[PDB]
Design a protein around this ligand. Sequence first.
Ligand SMILES: [Mg+2]
Ligand SMILES: [Mg+2]
Ligand SMILES: [Mg+2]
Ligand SMILES: [Mg+2]
Ligand SMILES: [Mg+2]
Ligand SMILES: [Mg+2]
Ligand SMILES: [Mg+2]
Ligand SMILES: [Mg+2]
Ligand SMILES: [Mg+2]
Ligand SMILES: [Mg+2]
Ligand SMILES: [Mg+2]
Ligand SMILES: [Zn+2]
Lengths: 224, 155, 104, 60, 43, 86, 129
Amino acid sequence: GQKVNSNGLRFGINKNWISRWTANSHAQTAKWLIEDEKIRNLFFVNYRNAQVSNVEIERTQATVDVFVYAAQPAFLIGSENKNIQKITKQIKQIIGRTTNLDLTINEIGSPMLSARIIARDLANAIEARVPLRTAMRQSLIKVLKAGANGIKVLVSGRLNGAEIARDKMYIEGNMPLSTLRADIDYALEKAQTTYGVIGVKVWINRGMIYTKGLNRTPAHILHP
Amino acid sequence: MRKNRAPKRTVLPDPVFNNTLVTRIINVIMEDGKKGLAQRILYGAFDLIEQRTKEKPLTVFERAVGNVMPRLELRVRRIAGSNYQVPTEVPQDRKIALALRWIAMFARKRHEKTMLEKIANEIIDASNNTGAAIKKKDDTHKMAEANKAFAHMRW
Amino acid sequence: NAVKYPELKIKLESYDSTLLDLTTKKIVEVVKGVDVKIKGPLPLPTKKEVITIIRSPHVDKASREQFEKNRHKRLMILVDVNQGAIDSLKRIKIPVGVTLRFSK
Amino acid sequence: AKKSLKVKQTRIPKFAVRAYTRCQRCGRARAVLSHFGVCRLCFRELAYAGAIPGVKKASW
Amino acid sequence: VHGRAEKLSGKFNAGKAFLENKTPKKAKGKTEEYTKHRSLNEL
Amino acid sequence: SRSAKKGAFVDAHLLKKVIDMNKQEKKRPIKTWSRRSTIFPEFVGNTFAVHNGKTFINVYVTDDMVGHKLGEFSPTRNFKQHTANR
Amino acid sequence: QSYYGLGRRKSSSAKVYLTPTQDKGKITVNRRDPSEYFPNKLVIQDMEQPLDLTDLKKNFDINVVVKGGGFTGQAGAIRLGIVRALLQFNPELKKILKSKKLTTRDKRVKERKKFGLYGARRAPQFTKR
RNA sequence: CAAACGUGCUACAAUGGCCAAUACAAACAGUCGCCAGCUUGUAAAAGUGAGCAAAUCUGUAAAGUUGGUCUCAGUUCGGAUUGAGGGCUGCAAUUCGUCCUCAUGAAGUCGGAAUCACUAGUAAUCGCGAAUCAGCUAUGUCGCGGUGAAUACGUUCUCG
RNA sequence: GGUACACGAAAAACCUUACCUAGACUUGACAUCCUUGGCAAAAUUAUGGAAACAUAAUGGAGGUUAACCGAGUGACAGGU
Ligand SMILES: [Mg+2]
Ligand SMILES: [Mg+2]
Ligand SMILES: [Mg+2]
Ligand SMILES: [Mg+2]
Ligand SMILES: [Mg+2]
Ligand SMILES: [Mg+2]
Ligand SMILES: [Mg+2]
Ligand SMILES: [Mg+2]
Ligand SMILES: [Mg+2]
Ligand SMILES: [Mg+2]
Ligand SMILES: [Mg+2]
Ligand SMILES: [Zn+2]
């Protein structure tokens, strides 16, 4: 049957919000919600070869702060800090010149056990006509060797260009979905294939959170 | 399948007459969940019973209700279809319950005026074993002796 | 010695609770490190809004989940502040989520 | 015919009553939340991602 | 024996006066100001 | 229904045409789409072509039709007989 | 030596103050006669069941303050409030009340309406054909 | 719109209709808003006009209690439909907004074959609030409280 | 059918609107890429107008083109 979104079911209990701001009124509350969505999608869609895992937004009456964690920030930084000013001008055009931007590119630790870049690597393999079984086996074993818990990958679509759509599941370990205390990271991606659309879903388990609290604690940023 | 009888809401204390049955019949004539209206109806009807029969209403009410109590109950069992009514002895709690439901149902159909006089007329008509609740009890009683044969087989 | 601000009524409200408790603790600690008599960090009723939205895209209005957004609120009124407190009040840095309603 | 409907809503009309509210991410017209300017089915994906601060699931 | 006329005519006169009065007082709003989110009075 | 202070309502394009058309003796059908303008005493004697949705149906106003709406004296839909489904 | 009780029922608080007296209890609810405040029914007595089965001759003056609920909830609240004040005067007395469960919260509150339902657990009329 | 079905509302009534006085909630919402009070109006409402960015100000609680009247009738039941006069929103109310006032007073007196929901603060029922919304016969939807029942012997039958 | 029928639609007078009848438009009301300039779009008042739209007006924030305002221009935009 249908299941509730794993990330959305754990928000406000064990997971903090990706955007943290309080608006003045309901008219400026709509702009500040669409603006971060355009901004967030920009980082992920283009500038993808960087494996950006998550972008958080923090806004006050007039000051915009962006915190972008990546595995390879060299592509953002560019040649002698080139690409970075460009993205800054891009961001300024999106929100407006009247505000203050405060980019804070932060390098990420333990990049693998993040469901965003793993899904991105999966999506890249499928678009590159790489066989799904072979592509999947390498990603699962490398993630598992990194020293994490079970990973759940759902790859539904017109598998291998077929005319009848299927779905392939692959569990490897204990995935307690009914538990709220687990640190489960969820992400979804659209693999654009020449024969249609492929849906990839990645559930990753990063241990048990035995410290109560709405996070306020670094996530997959700490090193081994 | 249930094979379990969880606590049956047990309450009895009565104030005006200390007769649990008064509280039961109040709840029976209750409609739309208005306790005050039904209690006024019963107490005004009880007040009406003082002015006619010149005796204690509780004694008259028990004498009516004890008279309405049925003895046999004809239930339903299968036999190639339909049911050859099998007579069974009803417990005392249900026995009183069936009596109270019947008194109210025949009271709310009389040609009389406000249910005060209506239920009062109905109850007084049942204290002399000649009324509408009696006939129903008579009817259910008369039907059971005729269908005495199938009493041995129940299920 | 001076006051320059009598009856400074600071009001706090935020979508989150724990951040709000942490911030009031920091505010009280700073304001008691200076010479101000805090009346007390009392809690006010939390205004909760709930929006009901149909899960399904096309049909089945019956299946509808629900969401909530709580506006936790606190009050704290300072009697006399003076520059000794006011100047130290400038370096507090309140985490974004928390909202201030200083009414002077 | 959606994008053009979206563009016309952005442009101001000649009468006040000619102005309606559409969703700002997609172009859905019906079931739009004025508190957020977002229709009911765009509000779900953003709420399930944490973009809106403080909107958690309800248990009552 | 007026046969309608007089009463509805007065209403028409009011409407024509309204139509000929029409002044482009186009506006959109009412109460104004008192719209902010405050700060630490200078942070 | 409609308030008093407000009064009646004509689009004033019909009103300007009617004043011009009342002065001109040789009146011809007036093609108006404003079925919403109420008939005012000066319209009397003229003929209009109200847009029913498809065509312009001609209405000759009289000293009696004054007060209602110009579209009320024309139809929009038509139904005159069903057909046995079976 | 006064006694204080805090009852509750159906979202209705109660502050009952028990004061020793010997000139008739003179029960009082919100500075008003209870026979004018509550319906003229056993509910007016419903509050006195624990003040009856034990005793009321001790003429305890009752000072009731209830803010919330209807009248049955308030009566239950003052009953619970009254019993909790009685649990400070005479231990044997306060016990003989439990012999009837009159010192326990009823735990009965109105349920929340659920979506798709005409009430807490109800459901639209079902049509099969 | 000759018709048929589904889901709800209103009823066929003195457990009630009408009139007068009057007691007791919770939750939510509010600055193009909530709108107190005052003046006018048979009323919908208009004008004046504070107060409230809100545990502060505003959004009349109704059932319930008492008193009066109606005396079982197609009625002081029931409100449909229709005519006229008004109020509000809006450029704009005929197609096709709703409210008030007056006028009229269809059917219907417990509903065939057959069916639905339900195991306590629950049925039944009485109000209150919010969403989308300039306005809207939403009687819809999502919520909140007031009163508050009956029954479960048993699995032989019935559906899964 | 259960699992459609106070369902999508948490508000169809205009708008919504995707439908019909008409009056108008064609790298288009919206977008990028390219050669090329910016010394505007608005809003509003006139006349003709059912209104689209035309002919005339205050020629407009700004910032020298930032954004947009355009020309030229074919790939194309667009489809509820
Ligand atoms: Mg589209
Ligand atoms: Mg609208
Ligand atoms: Mg006060
Ligand atoms: Mg008033
Ligand atoms: Mg009537
Ligand atoms: Mg009309
Ligand atoms: Mg059950
Ligand atoms: Mg289906
Ligand atoms: Mg239309
Ligand atoms: Mg210039
Ligand atoms: Mg230039
Ligand atoms: Zn949308």
